[PDB]
Design a binder for this molecule. Structure first.
Ligand SMILES: [Fe+3]
Ligand SMILES: [Mg+2]
Ligand SMILES: [Mg+2]
Ligand SMILES: [Mg+2]
Ligand SMILES: [Mg+2]
Lengths: 211, 196
């Protein structure tokens, strides 16, 4: 999904709000901040109502201006609440009644997702690959800066996981794929407009093709 | 035009979500409290520091950590949520590694601790992939001209830690002494361990 959450390479932001080793304070800066992660785990591990991938996608589905003005932990409160409503576990009415006011949610999905690709290749360390020049309106774990770009395999995972584009929509056809650490030269991604060396992206097999 | 939607206070919304689920019997007794304790007390960059100090003083462990990070971390019992498949990345005299999740906040929670606000910031997520030298410089870390910066974007299930270079002036230090100078920021890759 080409949403505003795909931030890598966006220009115009100011300084990172940190100096190295500065005191970052407590883990949680408010008494509710542990709730989104804890209730995500309730949903995933206890209820089996959704996957972690579905949580990523529902946050991506926040209305774009809403996403941009909402602090991190609050996005996950909104995302988990949205999933609970979409899965028929909770109603928006009861959330707003208990909250004592408006509780706007993420927008409905505009894609049913897609299955794990049928045709993929097992790649080896050192092989050159290109990121498939594909556009996916639903969940995908490929940041746009690498779409269509060429890099070299530095690692093939020894484990396999469900394809995000499927499990992020709760589909039954996510299968399993390993992922690959693909190293791109900075200039491959941003031309002359970068001060870096290389960027390594961890890409599902189904996002790749021989170069 | 472009205005924020009307919203109840965030605390009221977060606790409403808890109460709605809890009132339906869907949240076990002490569940969120248990997670809070895990997040605050167990998931910690002190664990990553321990791993680094061990690698620095034990060549055999160093090689295990760099070839099978998951197995190395398992020896200490530090695998966990958002830290089940671990890859450690080695800094060298010509290479500085830095970790980000440009798409959200993906972090090796059990060994680095939950990500800090700055790491989840739009500023870090947008900029470090494209201009890591300037970002690190602004944050207080000067990377020498003869050092390649490599940014790992945490886009799938691999969870990363940086193994920084061991600084001069620490020769013969105990593991406890070495652990002390390996900070959260060193494990993320934005800082270099400092010797007083
Ligand atoms: Fe993330
Ligand atoms: Mg985009
Ligand atoms: Mg606000
Ligand atoms: Mg030495
Ligand atoms: Mg001594």
């Amino acid at each position: 999904m080409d949403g505003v959450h795909d931030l890598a390479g966006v220009q115009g932001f100011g300084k990172v709000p940190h100096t190295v080793n500065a005191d970052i304070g407590p883990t949680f800066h408010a008494e509710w901040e542990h709730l989104p992660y804890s209730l995500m785990f309730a949903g995933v591990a206890e209820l089996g109502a959704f996957s972690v991938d579905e949580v990523r996608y529902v946050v991506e589905r926040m209305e774009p201006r809403h996403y941009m003005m909402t602090p991190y932990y609050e996005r996950y409160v909104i995302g988990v609440a949205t999933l609970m409503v979409e899965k028929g576990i909770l109603t928006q009415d009861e959330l707003e009644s208990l909250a004592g006011g408006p509780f706007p949610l993420s927008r409905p999905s505009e894609s049913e997702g897609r299955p794990a690709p049928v045709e993929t290749t097992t790649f080896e360390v050192g092989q050159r690959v290109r990121v498939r020049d594909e556009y996916v309106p639903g969940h995908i774990r490929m940041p746009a800066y690498c779409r269509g770009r060429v890099g070299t395999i530095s690692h093939r995972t020894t484990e396999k996981w469900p394809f995000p584009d499927a499990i992020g929509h709760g589909r039954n056809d996510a299968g399993e794929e390993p992922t690959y650490h693909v190293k791109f030269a900075a200039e491959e991604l941003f031309g002359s407009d970068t001060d870096g060396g290389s960027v390594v992206v961890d890409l599902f097999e189904g996002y790749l093709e021989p170069a | 035009e472009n205005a924020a939607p009307a919203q109840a206070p965030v605390s009221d919304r977060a606790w409403a979500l808890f109460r709605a689920l809890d009132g339906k019997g869907l949240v076990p007794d002490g569940y969120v409290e248990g997670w809070k304790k895990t997040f605050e007390e167990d998931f910690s960059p002190r664990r990553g520091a321990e791993l680094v100090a061990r690698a620095w003083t034990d060549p055999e462990f160093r090689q295990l950590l760099l070839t099978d990070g998951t197995a190395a971390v398992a020896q200490y019992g530090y695998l966990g949520p958002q830290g089940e498949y671990i890859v450690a990345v080695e800094d060298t005299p010509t290479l500085k590694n830095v970790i980000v999740c440009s798409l959200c906040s993906c972090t090796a929670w059990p060994i680095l601790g939950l990500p800090p606000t700055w790491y989840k910031s739009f500023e870090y997520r947008a900029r470090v992939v494209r201009e890591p030298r300037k970002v690190l410089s602004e944050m207080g870390t000067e990377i020498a001209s003869d050092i390649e910066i490599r940014v790992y974007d945490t886009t799938a299930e691999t969870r990363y830690m940086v193994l920084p270079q061991r600084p001069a002036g620490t020769e013969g230090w105990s593991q406890e002494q070495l652990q002390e100078i390996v900070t959260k920021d060193c494990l993320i890759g934005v800082a270099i361990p400092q010797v007083p």
